[PDB]
Amino acid sequence: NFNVAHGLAWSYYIGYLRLILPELQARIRTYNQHYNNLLRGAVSQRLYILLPLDCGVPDNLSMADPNIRFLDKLPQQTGDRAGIKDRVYSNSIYELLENGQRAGTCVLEYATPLQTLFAMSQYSQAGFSREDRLEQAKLFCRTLEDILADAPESQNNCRLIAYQEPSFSLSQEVLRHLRQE
């Protein structure tokens, strides 16, 4: 089933990352200058995408790890698309606590197509087994990695974070990539 993950990675790029990444620097700059608290640390540049290879995608990040608390939303981005006038592309800012203290703030979210791959393995009509789900999660990340390496929209404004759980601290995995800048 090579084509499911390949097709989903191309979709995630065309209908989402190629549309929001060119205008993401302006949205973060706008937040830091007019909506961000003058005393707190600046929101880091780049969209951080969590890619769990087990496809365990919760709807709220505070459940996945306690040290990732929701801070605020970025200014909404709108655009007419496929007949929907002013479709909204919203992104959330999170705090990454270390020793009970704000160590970094960034725009963070899961790659939604991995939640879709998990759900596909649960429906019988889909005809997709859970053994095929692990390789499809890897294929999705490799395809997206290849697309972004040669993409003009990807210009130091996106970071992929792949990981596999066997104590795995998700906040430390994000802080490792965030401090590498």
Place this chain on the structure above:
Amino acid sequence: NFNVAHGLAWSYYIGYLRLILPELQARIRTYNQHYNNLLRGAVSQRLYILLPLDCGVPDNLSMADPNIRFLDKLPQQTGDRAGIKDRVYSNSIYELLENGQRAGTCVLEYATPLQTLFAMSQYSQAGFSREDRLEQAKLFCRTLEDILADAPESQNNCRLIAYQEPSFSLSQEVLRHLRQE
């Protein structure tokens, strides 16, 4: 490339139609009772999805056919998803003119994965030809049709409109399905 369209149809259902169709009747009922003009006709029930098999998906419907003018938006639906707090699912209401007069109003939009399939055929890194795009557009509609026929969320609240252009009047194609209720 059977798996690209199959994977995109399952995605369109899991990450979109299974989430918005159970609460679509309430959104239309709310519009008709509090936001709709008391003198104009009621907004019809069901989400009408345009499925052009040529994958020609414009961002605005008034370009595709002049007799489809934008009326207003439905009340926005929000939900926390894949780490995005209050992600917005917005839908647009359109008027269908016949002989220069409002013949019907409905929630109408294109299936966005078909715009993605068109774009995939244009990128060389995707490895997807334009001959394979026509069969993939058909495979997507068949798979979505099969999913919705046995879906509990699909309970008289969704209508698929597939068509192929060779004068094709899109407004008449929508009014034909709308009057069949």
